[PDB]
RNA sequence: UUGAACUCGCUGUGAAGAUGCAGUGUACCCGCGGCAAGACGGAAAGACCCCGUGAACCUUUACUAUAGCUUGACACUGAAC
Ligand SMILES: [K+]
């Protein structure tokens with residue numbers, strides 16, 4: 344299937360590229376996510392005539408993501424409280440939803456889909472390092488302090 | 492049940508076990524109560540047996556198929572290393 348990329352897609356190409364991808368790749372991911380469109384004559388001519396504003400919007404999105412990442416980094420450390428045993432091990436667990444809620448209460452709005460926990464979901468009291476992905480290329484870090 | 496009967500015995504003859512043929516013996520016409528030796532008695536187009544290039548249902552390492560079960564290829568089906 345021939346498609347026109349509407350953004351930067353890793354291992355595929357840059358915006359405006361015309362690429363041949365597997366039909367399922369286009370059908371179930373790229374088009375529904377908005378990262379590409381079918382390479383019909385209408386689409387090709389329309390995009391080529393109306394192209395540059397899209398890079399302007401992509402730059403605006405990247406700048407907004409950078410600003411949000413800077414705010415997240417400036418937030419530094421966020422503290423979450425739960426219940427645990429005397430050994431410091433939590434009976435329950437601390438996940439993306441409540442981490443994002445704590446960050447939002449701290450001031451920066453982050454969705455649960457932007458939380459990236461490398462070593463699974465937190466289960467012990469102490470300090471952990473969590474990552475945030477607000478853009479496909481930028482990354483932020485937050486210290487999480489779990490207390491009883 | 493019943494082709495029609497003026498519907499005896501014997502010995503023979505004879506699709507080869509005769510009331511009905513031949514020879515011969517016996518016998519006046521007709522009921523009623525009884526008995527079942529014969530009318531190859533009545534009943535059911537022999538069930539045994541064979542035959543038909545008949546039937547059915549059953550069996551199986553008979554033949555040919557086939558549901559099911561199982562194998563792989565392609566499709567729905569994508570990304571990275
Ligand atoms: K005579």
Ligand SMILES: [K+]
Nearest residue numbers: 527528529532
């Ligand atoms: K009799």
Ligand SMILES: [K+]
Nearest residue numbers: 542543544545
């Ligand atoms: K035969």
Ligand SMILES: [K+]
Nearest residue numbers: 546547548549
């Ligand atoms: K039968």
Ligand SMILES: [Mg+2]
Nearest residue numbers: 504505507508
């Ligand atoms: Mg004789």
Ligand SMILES: [Mg+2]
Nearest residue numbers: 502503508509
């Ligand atoms: Mg005689």
Ligand SMILES: [Mg+2]
Nearest residue numbers: 522523524525
């Ligand atoms: Mg009498």
Ligand SMILES: [Mg+2]
Nearest residue numbers: 525526527528
């Ligand atoms: Mg009697």
Ligand SMILES: [Mg+2]
Nearest residue numbers: 531532533534
């Ligand atoms: Mg008889």
Ligand SMILES: [Mg+2]
Nearest residue numbers: 535536537538
């Ligand atoms: Mg017969």
Ligand SMILES: [Mg+2]
Nearest residue numbers: 545546547548
């Ligand atoms: Mg047969």
